[PDB]
């Protein structure tokens, strides 16, 4: 029973002690909702902690870290207890054990601890987990081990507020540059998702990704055979193009747009939404980058999703037509109109997402403000396609930001 296990774990006889921690591990690895609460209150934690120090007994160290790993895999209150029992420095000491079964289970325990919070992340980092962890990446390492290493490397990147230190980011990227060429499916997915979080932190870390030189190996993953790899890559590269125009160009300089005809027509709508969301930020840059969306024959595919796509895809598509409207030249907006952008763009005012309504009308505002002579020409298109009637009825007080816009547009051109 429980009380006997917590007692037999203190024996001086290794035989009874080991066979007692083996029982403490199974009770934590016998289902998916283990009795972890009753295990913490059972006082087993300090005995499991001290077992980590028995360099003379490796099999005791393995079973001890396994038990502590699964307790850390629970809630934050469950994970705090493992770190509150002074087990983190002993795990780090085990990273250099001459028994690979002990090195691996110590890595596994640290990842769950790192994943709980940025405080617990910076704690294990300050002690120096990155340098020995990345020392495991080698030819002779098994694949099941490397998968655990890459996953801890994800949590080392996972949180952005506060973001991980630069010293650690500068140490991880030269390993991602090595792990991005792996053949295993799960390793590559984790190697790209870590890039997604590093590109999600901020522009200061996006340049670290750029300066590392890994983007030329990240863009071709937009056409990888596995959808799991593109989804992370589409998110990873999708964040890079959210900073400065000089950083977005590095993405386009890797022929990023030549991978999107297979994404704008993908059957999965999540990819479609994630694809147009990328092109939206591209339409926010300078005119040369806006022209790159035009020189790739992507605008008709954006408009098609703007017409027949889903709500989440149309929201990012209306954004894509908007950022281009207030940034590009007159012929680029004129190119939009001759591509029959007028009918579907106005058919999104009836949505209850005020953000989209503001987006289209502002884009509807900047269109009419750019074609100075073709005001009557374009106005007939909006009136014939049924937009003006929807423009007229948008003068309601349920949002002054919309009311003010839908009136000035009418007062100047209608």
């Amino acid at each position: 029973s429980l009380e006997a296990i917590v007692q037999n774990a203190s024996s001086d006889n290794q035989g009874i002690q080991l066979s007692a921690v083996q029982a403490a591990r199974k009770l934590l690895s016998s289902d998916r909702n283990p009795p972890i609460d009753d295990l913490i209150k059972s006082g087993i934690l300090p005995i499991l902690v001290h077992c980590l120090e028995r360099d003379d007994n490796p099999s005791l160290q393995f079973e001890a870290a396994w038990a502590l790993t699964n307790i850390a895999s629970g809630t934050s209150e469950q994970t705090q207890a493992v770190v509150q029992s002074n087990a983190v420095p002993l795990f780090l000491r085990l990273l250099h054990s001459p028994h690979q079964n002990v090195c691996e289970q110590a890595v596994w325990a640290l990842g769950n601890i790192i994943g709980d919070g940025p405080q617990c992340r910076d704690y294990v980092i300050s002690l120096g987990v990155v340098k020995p962890l990345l020392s495991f990446i080698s030819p002779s390492i098994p694949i099941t081990f490397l998968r655990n290493v890459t996953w801890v490397m994800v949590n080392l990147c996972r949180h952005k507020d506060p973001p991980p230190p630069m010293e650690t980011i500068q140490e991880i990227l030269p390993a991602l540059c090595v792990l991005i060429h792996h053949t295993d499916v799960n390793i590559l997915v984790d190697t790209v998702w870590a890039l997604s979080y590093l590109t999600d932190a901020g522009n200061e870390q996006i340049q670290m990704v750029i300066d590392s030189g890994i983007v030329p190996h990240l863009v071709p993953l937009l056409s990888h055979q596995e959808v799991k790899v593109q989804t992370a890559a589409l998110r990873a590269v999708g964040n890079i193009v959210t900073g400065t125009d000089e950083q977005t160009q590095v993405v386009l300089n890797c022929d990023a747009l030549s991978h999107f005809p297979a994404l704008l027509t993908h059957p999965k709508e999540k990819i479609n939404k994630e694809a147009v969301w990328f092109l939206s930020n591209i339409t926010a840059g300078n005119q040369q980058q806006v022209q790159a969306v035009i020189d790739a024959n992507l605008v008709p595919m954006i408009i098609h999703l703007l017409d027949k796509g889903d709500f989440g895809t149309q929201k990012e598509a209306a954004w894509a037509i908007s950022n281009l409207t207030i940034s590009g030249r007159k012929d680029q907006v004129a190119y939009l109109i001759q591509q029959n952008v007028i009918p579907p763009f106005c058919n999104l005012l009836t949505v209850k997402d005020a953000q989209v309504v503001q987006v289209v009308l502002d884009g509807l505002s900047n269109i009419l403000k750019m074609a100075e002579d073709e005001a009557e020409t374009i106005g007939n298109l909006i009136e014939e396609c049924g937009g003006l009637e929807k423009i007229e009825q948008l003068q309601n007080h349920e949002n002054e930001d919309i009311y003010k816009l839908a009136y000035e547009i009418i007062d100047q051109f209608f």
């Binding site: 199974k26 934590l28 994970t79 769950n112 709980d116 994800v154 989804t231």
Partner: peptide, 14 residues
């Protein structure tokens, strides 16, 4: 949709 997990258990068989 397959975001990598935050925490992980190691299941036994045995």
């Amino acid at each position: 949709n397959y975001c990598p997990p935050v925490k992980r258990e190691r299941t036994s068989s045995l």
